Design a binder for this molecule. Structure first.
Ligand SMILES: [Mg+2]
Ligand SMILES: [Mg+2]
Ligand SMILES: [Mg+2]
Ligand SMILES: [Mg+2]
Ligand SMILES: [Mg+2]
Ligand SMILES: [Mg+2]
Ligand SMILES: [Mg+2]
Ligand SMILES: [Mg+2]
Ligand SMILES: [Mg+2]
Ligand SMILES: [Mg+2]
Ligand SMILES: [Mg+2]
Ligand SMILES: [Mg+2]
Ligand SMILES: [Mg+2]
Ligand SMILES: [Mg+2]
Ligand SMILES: [Mg+2]
Ligand SMILES: [Mg+2]
Ligand SMILES: [Mg+2]
Ligand SMILES: [Mg+2]
Ligand SMILES: [Mg+2]
Ligand SMILES: [Mg+2]
Ligand SMILES: [Mg+2]
Ligand SMILES: [Mg+2]
Ligand SMILES: [Mg+2]
Ligand SMILES: [Mg+2]
Ligand SMILES: [Mg+2]
Ligand SMILES: [Mg+2]
Ligand SMILES: [Mg+2]
Ligand SMILES: [Mg+2]
Ligand SMILES: [Mg+2]
Ligand SMILES: [Mg+2]
Ligand SMILES: [Mg+2]
Ligand SMILES: [Mg+2]
Ligand SMILES: [Mg+2]
Ligand SMILES: [Mg+2]
Ligand SMILES: [Mg+2]
Lengths: 76, 58, 117, 94, 136
RNA sequence: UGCCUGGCGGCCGUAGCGCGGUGGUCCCACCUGACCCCAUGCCGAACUCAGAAGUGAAACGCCGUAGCGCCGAUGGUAGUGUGGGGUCUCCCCAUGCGAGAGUAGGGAACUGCCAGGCAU
RNA sequence: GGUUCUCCCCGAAAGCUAUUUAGGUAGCGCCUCGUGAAUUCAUCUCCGGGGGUAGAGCACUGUUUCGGCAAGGGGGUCACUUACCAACCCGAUGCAAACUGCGAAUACCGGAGAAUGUUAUCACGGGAGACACACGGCGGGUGCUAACGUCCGUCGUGAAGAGGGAAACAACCCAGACCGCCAGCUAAGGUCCCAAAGUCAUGGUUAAGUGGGAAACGAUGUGGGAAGGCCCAGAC
RNA sequence: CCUCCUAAAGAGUAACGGAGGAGCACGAAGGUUGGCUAAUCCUGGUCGGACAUCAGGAGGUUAGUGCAAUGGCAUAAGCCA
RNA sequence: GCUCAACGGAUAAAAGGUACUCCGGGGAUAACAGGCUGAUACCGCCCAAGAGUUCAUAUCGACGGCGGUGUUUGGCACCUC
């Protein structure tokens, strides 16, 4: 039947890019699935939000046999 | 470094905002304004963005 | 899945969690004929201490290399060698095998000998 | 025996290649072997009338780059989308 | 009359028809009818041209149609204001960029293929050229 | 020090698949037995325990091999930021950036810790 | 609808959100005044990032044509067979906003550094206006790649901007007017006369007043270029 | 209110633009420990057929996810105790 | 304990008629005419299967193609409420 509907934009995406200094707890990426996976010092929330578990620099990296994206936190 | 002279050659009217920001970065005020600046790559980057409207004398 | 691949799959989750926690792990390997034990540093690329039934010094005082008694011997051996190098706190990695029989005998022996897990 | 005259390219890229075509000339490449690939320019009319003959794509051709002679074979041809013109030729060392 | 048998979606955004064609070579027959222009070919134009060239070769040889009208075209009727939803699909077009080989033929002498293509070209909204098969 | 094997990693197809060959003293595997520890929505297949009569058949490791995967230039082409222009649905020029596909070619992995067998 | 003396400084908006709201109002955005605070902010350079867009491609999701091979459906059997149709698979060829085994240019986030910029930045407090936008460029949706149409994004100008050019002509091009000058140089655009400046120089093209409106298509119009067929064994 | 595209590769972005869905369910369909791995096609097999259950091979997640879409998911987030 | 779903919810509580009409406003917004546009319309051409005993173009002309006008049916809401 008729169209006309759409939902509110969920403001997902990368909140802190590579090199950015973050304090423990800071959301690095809001995503729907695990487009990025949690690496060293990075936690994964119930809505697959990746967050900092320790103060430091955001590091993006491709690891493993499945060539997956990982967000980690390097000490600064 | 060495000193160079830059002169605005065309009007800033109608130019992209970023280009107006660049002319402010060079301290160029009006058409024909010649200015003495240090020949560094940062000054040479600014000159390059607004190349169409400045003349350089080395 | 074939026996080996099926076992590695069974072992992957715990090993990744141990990697994440940065824990020193006591890795056990089992075979019909032999039982092995290695204490691997959190990096996972270097062995601190090891003991097995392929070792002439251990197999000599044992009836059969692939039984619960041999497993208890390998267990006592790693813990003793680990404690001589100052390694006290570890995390047991059953490596896809059930925590039972031979694997259990090795872990109960290491616990007895003084290893903390 | 097809004999193609060529000069070495003093420039490379979009700007420079388009300037050749406007000047009734076209870029081409010579590659293969231990030797480094040679970026060359060809006269459009001359090569165009040559490639009209089926033998051009089968036979071993000789490219004359500043005196020197190079035995090659036509590897690939980039033609104009709708005009009877040549855009670029790949020559492989024979 | 050519048309997709089924489609994921009924209607499609207008879009643009920029760039040069893909499929610029006689890949199946001996001769071709290449587009020199840019435009849309309707399913009716494609059929009209196909019929003309077929009659020309007296249904000898083989014909290939390298284009497919997979683009749905909508239209608002008379006495209808703007808005109130996208119009209804009326016809199907194939976007044509310069270089597209539209039709291919073989099994006929060059002179005949040239005439057949001259006759079909007159039914098309865009400028064409006769093309022959090439060795690479 | 060399060769071989097992474990745990690095790396994540130049590393994989296929095809051919090859290895059992040791290791590994199949294997033997099963009342029992333990197990099967049934089954000792798997999990598991007690072993050593047999075999490298399978698997696994190694060696070879470009059928496939994979890596991949150079050159040209497509696009595009800025400035300019035309016949302005689309293009062109100056300048900077510059693919994707294809082509030549590469390619039958490389590497660390520990342990065991053998040899000098 | 109207709102009355003067000069000076700064200087918007026609957006978002909510609204019995839609030509009203409120918070935020943007303006102004004040207080305070860091090299706070901008440009550029070098360094650290994530893209899935343009383009491309066709393994995936669909769609599409040709060839090869073919389970299966339709008609004769009284299981066998056929000038039919034919998914999958292989080779070849395209198409995609809601396809991606690829993938830019830009843009954006972060770090450091200089120069420049009347703090341009942030916070708090006083005072607002404004929430009808318009055209032009680029990227799109809608419509007919119709509209001086309509709806987003982004930049420019008008709005709130005079001067020169585009005959005239908010929104295009050049350029931002504190005041005086019967000085000079330039921009866009121009230089035969109206009308300031070349009846300038040099080399070509056109003969249509083309220039100074318009397409498919048509034609021994004329200039340049590369090739070819026939021909003194006599071509046209 | 939710999902995708329009949306111009950060976020956001309009129209009576293009397509769909929600106004619930579940004491297990939640927690944990231990285990397990689909779709589809080919071959063989009582009744049994194009398709039920059984066996082997190819395949490799195209399946599955209480439900729309998109992003995820094998260390499974899928399936069992 | 509200499908206060008009979902930031005016009340616990509410449908219509006016050609008998009235006021404040708007060309912010329709009807006439102008304007922009030209899908539609009207006029012309390009191609030529075929009709025309024979022969495409005497006269016509299918499948399709390109324009001109501002001129019908419309679109828009720029001018005048
Ligand atoms: Mg360029
Ligand atoms: Mg067994
Ligand atoms: Mg073997
Ligand atoms: Mg490059
Ligand atoms: Mg690249
Ligand atoms: Mg490439
Ligand atoms: Mg490739
Ligand atoms: Mg090779
Ligand atoms: Mg050794
Ligand atoms: Mg001011
Ligand atoms: Mg209300
Ligand atoms: Mg960088
Ligand atoms: Mg595209
Ligand atoms: Mg086929
Ligand atoms: Mg303030
Ligand atoms: Mg309002
Ligand atoms: Mg408004
Ligand atoms: Mg607007
Ligand atoms: Mg308008
Ligand atoms: Mg106003
Ligand atoms: Mg004037
Ligand atoms: Mg004069
Ligand atoms: Mg005229
Ligand atoms: Mg004669
Ligand atoms: Mg976005
Ligand atoms: Mg963007
Ligand atoms: Mg579940
Ligand atoms: Mg588990
Ligand atoms: Mg069967
Ligand atoms: Mg409301
Ligand atoms: Mg009244
Ligand atoms: Mg009006
Ligand atoms: Mg009217
Ligand atoms: Mg309007
Ligand atoms: Mg009027």
């Amino acid at each position: 039947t008729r169209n006309g509907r759409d939902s509110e934009a969920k403001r997902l995406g990368v909140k802190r890019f590579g090199g950015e200094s973050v304090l423990a707890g800071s959301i690095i990426v809001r995503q729907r699935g695990t487009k990025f996976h949690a690496g060293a010092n990075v936690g994964c929330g119930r809505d697959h939000t990746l967050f900092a578990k320790a103060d430091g620099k955001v590091k993006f990296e491709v690891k493993g046999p499945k060539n997956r994206k990982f967000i980690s936190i390097e000490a600064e | 470094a060495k000193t160079i002279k830059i002169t605005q050659t065309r009007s800033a009217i109608g130019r992209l905002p970023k280009h107006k920001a660049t002319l402010l970065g060079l301290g160029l005020r009006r058409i024909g304004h010649t200015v003495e600046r240090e020949d560094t790559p940062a000054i040479r980057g600014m000159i390059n963005a607004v190349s169409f409207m400045v003349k350089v004398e080395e | 899945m074939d026996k080996k691949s099926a076992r590695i799959r069974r072992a992957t989750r715990a090993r990744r969690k141990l990697q994440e926690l940065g824990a020193t792990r006591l890795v056990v390997h089992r075979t019909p004929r032999h039982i092995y034990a290695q204490v691997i540093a959190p990096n996972g690329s270097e062995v601190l201490v090891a003991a097995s039934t392929v070792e002439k010094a251990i197999a000599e005082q044992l009836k059969y290399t692939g039984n619960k008694d041999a497993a208890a011997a390998v267990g006592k051996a790693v813990a003793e060698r680990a404690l001589e190098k100052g390694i006290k706190d570890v995390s047991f990695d059953r490596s896809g095998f059930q925590y039972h029989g031979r694997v259990q005998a090795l872990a109960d022996a290491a616990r007895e000998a003084g290893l903390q897990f | 025996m097809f004999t193609i005259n060529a000069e070495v390219r003093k420039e490379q890229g979009k700007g420079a290649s388009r300037r050749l075509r406007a000047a009734n000339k076209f870029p081409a490449i010579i590659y293969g072997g231990k030797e480094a690939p040679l970026a060359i320019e060809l006269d459009h009319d001359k090569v165009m009338n040559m490639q009209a003959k089926a033998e051009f794509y089968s036979e071993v051709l000789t490219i004359v780059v500043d005196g020197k002679e190079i035995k090659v074979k036509a590897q690939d041809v980039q033609r104009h989308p709708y005009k009877p013109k040549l855009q670029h030729i790949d020559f492989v060392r024979a | 009359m050519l048309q997709p048998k089924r489609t994921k979606f009924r209607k499609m955004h207008k879009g643009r028809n920029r760039g040069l064609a893909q499929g610029t070579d006689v890949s199946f027959g001996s001769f071709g009818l290449k587009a020199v222009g840019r435009g849309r070919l309707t399913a009716r134009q494609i059929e009209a041209a196909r019929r003309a060239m077929t009659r020309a070769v007296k249904r000898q040889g083989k014909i290939w149609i390298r284009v497919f009208p997979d683009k749905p075209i909508t239209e608002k009727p008379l006495a209808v204001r703007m808005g109130k939803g996208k119009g209804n699909v009326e016809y199907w077009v194939a976007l044509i960029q310069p270089g597209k080989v539209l039709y291919e033929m073989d099994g006929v002498p060059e002179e005949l293929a040239r005439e057949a293509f001259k006759l079909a070209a007159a039914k098309l909204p865009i400028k064409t050229t006769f093309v022959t098969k090439t060795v690479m």
